[PDB]
RNA sequence: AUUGCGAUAACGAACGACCUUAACCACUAAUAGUGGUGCUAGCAUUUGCUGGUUCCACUUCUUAGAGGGACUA
RNA sequence: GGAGCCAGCGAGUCUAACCUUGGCCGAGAGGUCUUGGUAAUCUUGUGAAACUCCGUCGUGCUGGGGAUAGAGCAUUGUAAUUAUUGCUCUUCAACGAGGAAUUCCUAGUAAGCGCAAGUCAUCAGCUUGCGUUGAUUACGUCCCUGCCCUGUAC
């Protein structure tokens, strides 16, 4: 099922054309358990994502 | 003679001019009642400065407006501005400053363009 | 096949019983589920509205919207 | 009530609007609710307006367009192909008729049906080229943009070489997409994007 | 009181055209139903019988609201775009011969008269006539 | 950017890289505009409303010319 | 098809015949008698087009589209044949959204719509400028194209 997460920090642009932003996101159901994800569109702090897969981490 | 003011509004190349004086609430544009302004789909864009403050405010004053240039749409936006600016200018001189700012609070809450021209201009060469 | 452009007695009888069934009726609806041409549908609506079988809510020449009541 | 007579008599039906602003003087914004918490900040339905035409300028700051009312956002995307550019008054009339139809097919407050279609249609995962593809998450603003584009494109193609008018087909798209109905063009498109993303993640 | 300015345009015109036709004094040119009314048009007027009365009404109102007019300005007013085939569109003036006879006809029933400084101006009987139809059109509401 | 702190067998010197728009306000002038006045048409008749054609007042709108109005705040 | 009805930038004669209002004739193109202007003053409120409202048409290469072609009536010019341009009736072609490739563009901007000037006896689908209606999508990067800067006698 879906999981909501809140953007707490924006880290930088990535990808061969800069089309993707890396972001650090905090789970909304319980704080901590923070994970880092790749986001396609324009994004800001306090935005909410719908993580459809949870146990996966952005490349680095 | 009689308490009166005149004010103007702008949009792009339209220029509405309004006279306000004491009397019995009538509102005419180019000598015709405001209920006939055209196109029909935009007509509420002109009722805004009336319904937003309330009709009771107009019972003692006559508004008549002339609009001149521009196009069909741009001149509609001109007249609504001339009415709003005209109304506060009348209060500013002939009643207290308290009611004047009561009006402003209502207008600028809904849409800044009721008082201030948008200042966009054609791009130079 | 081709849409009908002159009204036979059978379809006239059909119209009067079927149209009160529909929630929403318009030129497009009569041409679709009945098989009359568009020039009949514009005539039918004016007749049925005059007769009181359908209720108008808006009219615009390029669109028309009538309801069950 | 307040009939307030004037030397130019304003019609009764306009005076009655003096108490609350309704869209096209017909439907209320009150009790419209964005049902997904993730989109509440990005679907302007809070400031009421009389008519879906405004001068407003929104291109100057990159998130500022999020404040534009959703109904006006929709009308803009009808003005699309080159033969229709700039013809906003044409588009406004189309919306006016569309909401009427939705108030008769089904019986909800029609502006509520629009909000459902938007929230229900935007993709929630996507892919990018690295050749190969990699799956990525999608931001809430882009979710709204995608929904609007898919809805009007589906309507436009359905009404080409038509008999139904634009208003008829746009109304049908919105209703089918507020349901989970795969018959709508937009629902099919969303599904393909997500299942491909699943394959590559 | 009431003035022509108090009534919607395509509501006054329909009413007055219907009235003017019933009186039967308005003299028609007789070549009606052949003429296109414009060199930019394709096909003649679609309302075969009524169209001459409709234009007579429109001209009367247009003069009433203005200081004076002449035939040339009317041709500009009723002009339109002509397709010019494969070349781009252009503005073209309407037929002169229609409009000239319209003004001559209205003058015989006394609605309009020749002005100094040229062109035509409204007669006082024209004012009195048009103001009466205006009142009836609102009252019918 | 040879655009600068500092360091110190160096010190002191030479080309390339100011002028007009947008935008607010005092001053002009009228061939532009507004209001009043005399006469006058229609409607209605609290004495109003929409127009036509002899003077008077003004400059806000228009005008065009001139004068002043961001330095990283 | 009928009705509604709104701009900005230009240019114009005595050197003589430019821009043309108004009246009359003609289905139209056009003709004819007078008139204002060497121009913020007159043409000119350049009453522009898209656009708005009410009707006819009904998904049929159809009333979409108007190439090719026949007959006739006018205008410029010393002269229109291989045909300047305009008008009227008739003829009614391809074209059902276009493969590989490829151009311009970040706000009063793209695109849609029209007008004036240039050349000029006549002759625009051209060039420049002006206004009317007015969006979608970024606010980034070095993946592609291209430019610039900071081991060795070669």
Curated annotation (Swiss-Prot), chain A:
Annotated SUPFAM superfamilies: Nucleic acid-binding proteins (SSF50249)
Any one Gene Ontology molecular-function term assigned to this protein's record: structural constituent of ribosome
Cysteine pairings via disulfide bonds:
none
UniProt key word Ribosomal protein: yes
Entry comment on modification after translation: N-terminally acetylated by acetyltransferase NatB.
Q: Which domain of life is it from?
A: Eukaryota
Stated role: Component of the ribosome, a large ribonucleoprotein complex responsible for the synthesis of proteins in the cell. The small ribosomal subunit (SSU) binds messenger RNAs (mRNAs) and translates the encoded message by selecting cognate aminoacyl-transfer RNA (tRNA) molecules. The large subunit (LSU) contains the ribosomal catalytic site termed the peptidyl transferase center (PTC), which catalyzes the formation of peptide bonds, thereby polymerizing the amino acids delivered by tRNAs into a polypeptide chain.
Question: Tell me, how does this one assemble?
Answer: Component of the small ribosomal subunit (SSU). Mature yeast ribosomes consist of a small (40S) and a large (60S) subunit. The 40S small subunit contains 1 molecule of ribosomal RNA (18S rRNA) and 33 different proteins (encoded by 57 genes). The large 60S subunit contains 3 rRNA molecules (25S, 5.8S and 5S rRNA) and 46 different proteins (encoded by 81 genes).
- Name of the protein in its database record: Small ribosomal subunit protein eS28A
Q: Which gene encodes it?
A: RPS28A
Swiss-Prot record, chain B:
GO terms under biological process: maturation of SSU-rRNA from tricistronic rRNA transcript (SSU-rRNA, 5.8S rRNA, LSU-rRNA); translational initiation
Name of the featured protein: Small ribosomal subunit protein uS9A
**Cellular compartment(s):** Cytoplasm
Q: What NCBIfam families does UniProt report for this protein, alphabetically?
A: PRK00474.1
Where in this protein does the record say Phosphothreonine is found? 68
> Lineage of the native species?
Eukaryota, Fungi, Dikarya, Ascomycota, Saccharomycotina
Keyword Phosphoprotein in the entry? The reply is yes
Q: Which GO terms describe its cellular component?
A: 90S preribosome; cytosol; cytosolic small ribosomal subunit
Name of the encoding gene: RPS16A
What GO molecular function annotations does the UniProt record carry, in alphabetical order?
A: RNA binding; structural constituent of ribosome
Further remark, if any?
A: Present with 33800 molecules/cell in log phase SD medium. There are 2 genes for uS9 in yeast.
| Protein family per UniProt | Belongs to the universal ribosomal protein uS9 family.
Per the record, residues carrying Phosphoserine are 32, 59, 74
Query: PANTHER family recorded for this chain?
Result: RIBOSOMAL PROTEIN S16 (PTHR21569:SF16), RIBOSOMAL PROTEIN S9 (PTHR21569)
* InterPro entries the UniProt entry points to: Ribosomal_Su5_D2-typ_SF (IPR020568), Ribosomal_uS9 (IPR000754), Ribosomal_uS9_CS (IPR020574), Ribsml_uS5_D2-typ_fold_subgr (IPR014721)
Q: What does this protein do?
A: Component of the ribosome, a large ribonucleoprotein complex responsible for the synthesis of proteins in the cell. The small ribosomal subunit (SSU) binds messenger RNAs (mRNAs) and translates the encoded message by selecting cognate aminoacyl-transfer RNA (tRNA) molecules. The large subunit (LSU) contains the ribosomal catalytic site termed the peptidyl transferase center (PTC), which catalyzes the formation of peptide bonds, thereby polymerizing the amino acids delivered by tRNAs into a polypeptide chain.
Which PROSITE patterns is this protein grouped with? RIBOSOMAL_S9
From Swiss-Prot, chain C:
Q: Name one GO molecular function term.
A: structural constituent of ribosome
Q: Which domain of life is it from?
A: Eukaryota
Localization (cell): Cytoplasm
Keyword Cytoplasm set for record: yes
Which keywords does the record carry?
Cytoplasm, Methylation, Ribonucleoprotein, Ribosomal protein
The principal location of this protein is: cytoplasm
Q: What else is known?
A: It is presumed that the precursor part of S25 is engaged in assembling of the small subunit, thus being essential in ribosome maturation. Present with 322000 molecules/cell in log phase SD medium.
Q: How does it assemble?
A: Component of the small ribosomal subunit (SSU). Mature yeast ribosomes consist of a small (40S) and a large (60S) subunit. The 40S small subunit contains 1 molecule of ribosomal RNA (18S rRNA) and 33 different proteins (encoded by 57 genes). The large 60S subunit contains 3 rRNA molecules (25S, 5.8S and 5S rRNA) and 46 different proteins (encoded by 81 genes).
Q: Which family does it belong to?
A: Belongs to the eukaryotic ribosomal protein eS25 family.
Q: What is this protein called?
A: Small ribosomal subunit protein eS25A
Q: What is the lineage of its organism?
A: Eukaryota, Fungi, Dikarya, Ascomycota, Saccharomycotina
UniProtKB/Swiss-Prot annotation, chain D:
Cross-link Glycyl lysine isopeptide (Lys-Gly) (interchain with G-Cter in ubiquitin): residue positions: 26, 179
Q: Which GO terms describe its cellular component?
A: 90S preribosome; cytoplasm; cytosol; cytosolic small ribosomal subunit; ribosome
Modified residue annotations for Phosphothreonine: 8
PTM per Swiss-Prot/TrEMBL: N-terminally acetylated by acetyltransferase NatA.
* Record's subcellular location: Cytoplasm
As given in the record, the signal peptide range reads: none
A Pfam family per the record: Ribosomal_S7
Keywords attached to this entry: Acetylation, Cytoplasm, Isopeptide bond, Phosphoprotein, Ribonucleoprotein, Ribosomal protein, Ubl conjugation
What GO biological process terms does the UniProt entry carry, in alphabetical order?
Answer: cytoplasmic translation; maturation of SSU-rRNA; regulation of translational fidelity; ribosomal small subunit assembly; ribosomal subunit export from nucleus; translation
Which GO terms fall under molecular function for this chain's record? mRNA binding; rRNA binding; structural constituent of ribosome
Q: Which PROSITE patterns match?
A: RIBOSOMAL_S7 (PS00052)
SUPFAM superfamilies the record matches: Ribosomal protein S7 (SSF47973)
- Highest taxon of the source? Eukaryota
Listed under subunit, the entry gives: Component of the small ribosomal subunit (SSU). Mature yeast ribosomes consist of a small (40S) and a large (60S) subunit. The 40S small subunit contains 1 molecule of ribosomal RNA (18S rRNA) and 33 different proteins (encoded by 57 genes). The large 60S subunit contains 3 rRNA molecules (25S, 5.8S and 5S rRNA) and 46 different proteins (encoded by 81 genes).
The entry's family comment says: Belongs to the universal ribosomal protein uS7 family.
Put simply, this protein is called: Small ribosomal subunit protein uS7
Q: Which species does the entry assign this protein to?
A: Saccharomyces cerevisiae (strain ATCC 204508 / S288c)
């Amino acid at each position: 099922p879906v999981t909501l997460a809140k953007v707490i920090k924006v880290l930088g642009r990535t990808g061969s054309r800069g089309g993707v932003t890396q972001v650090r996101v905090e789970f909304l159901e319980d704080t901590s358990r923070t994970i880092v994800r790749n986001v396609k569109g324009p994004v800001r702090e306090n935005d909410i994502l719908v993580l459809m897969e949870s146990e996966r981490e952005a490349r680095r | 003679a009689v308490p009166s003011v005149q004010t103007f509004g702008k949009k792009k190349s339209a220029t509405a001019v309004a006279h306000v004086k004491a009397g019995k609430g009538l509102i005419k544009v180019n000598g015709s009642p405001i209920t006939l302004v055209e196109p029909e789909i935009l007509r509420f864009k002109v009722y805004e400065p009336l319904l937003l403050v309330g009709l009771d405010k107009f019972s003692n004053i006559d508004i008549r407006v002339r609009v001149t240039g521009g196009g069909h749409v741009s001149q509609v936006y001109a007249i609504r501005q001339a009415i709003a600016k005209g109304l506060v200018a009348y209060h500013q001189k002939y009643v207290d400053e308290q009611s004047k700012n009561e009006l402003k609070k209502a207008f600028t809450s809904y849409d800044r363009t009721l008082l201030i021209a948008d200042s966009r201009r054609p791009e130079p060469k | 096949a081709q849409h009908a452009v002159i009204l036979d007695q059978e379809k006239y009888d059909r119209i009067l019983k079927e149209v009160p069934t529909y929630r929403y009726v318009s030129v497009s609806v009569l041409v679709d589920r009945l098989k009359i041409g568009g020039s009949l549908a514009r005539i039918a609506l004016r007749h049925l509205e005059k007769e009181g079988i359908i209720k108008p809510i808006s009219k615009h020449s390029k669109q028309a919207i009538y309801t069950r009541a | 009530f307040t009939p307030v007579v004037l030397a130019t008599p304003i019609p009764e039906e306009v005076q009655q609007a003096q108490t609350e602003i309704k869209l096209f003087n017909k439907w209320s914004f009150e009790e419209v609710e964005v049902k997904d918490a993730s989109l509440v900040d990005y679907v302007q339905v809070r400031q009421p307006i009389f008519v879906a035409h405004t001068a407003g300028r929104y291109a100057n700051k990159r998130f500022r367009k999020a404040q534009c009312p959703i109904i006006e956002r929709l009308t803009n995307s009808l003005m699309m192909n080159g033969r229709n550019n700039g013809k906003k008054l044409k588009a406004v009339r189309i919306i006016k008729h569309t909401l009427d139809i939705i108030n008769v097919l089904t019986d909800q407050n029609p502006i509520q049906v629009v909000v459902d279609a938007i929230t229900n249609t935007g993709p929630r995962e996507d892919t990018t080229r690295v050749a190969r593809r990699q799956a990525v998450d999608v931001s809430p603003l882009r979710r709204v943009n995608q929904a609007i584009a898919l809805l009007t494109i589906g309507a436009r193609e359905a009404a080409f070489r038509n008999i139904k008018t634009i208003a008829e087909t746009l109304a049908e798209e919105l209703i089918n997409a507020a349901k989970g109905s795969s018959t709508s063009y937009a629902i099919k498109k969303k599904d393909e994007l997500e299942r491909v993303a699943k394959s590559n993640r | 009181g009431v003035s022509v300015r108090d009534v919607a345009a395509q509501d006054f015109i329909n009413a007055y055209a219907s009235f003017l036709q019933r009186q039967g004094k308005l003299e028609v040119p007789g070549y009606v139903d052949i003429v296109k009314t414009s060199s930019g048009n394709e096909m003649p007027p679609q309302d075969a019988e009524g169209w001459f009365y409709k234009r007579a009404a429109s001209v009367a109102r247009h003069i009433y609201m203005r200081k004076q007019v002449g035939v040339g300005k009317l041709n500009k007013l009723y002009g339109g775009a002509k397709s010019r085939g494969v070349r781009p569109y252009k503005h073209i003036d309407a037929s002169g011969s229609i409009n000239r006879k319209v003004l001559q006809a209205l003058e015989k029933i006394g609605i309009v008269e020749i002005s100094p400084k040229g062109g035509r101006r409204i007669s006082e009987n024209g004012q009195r006539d048009l103001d009466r139809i205006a009142a009836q059109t609102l009252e019918e509401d």
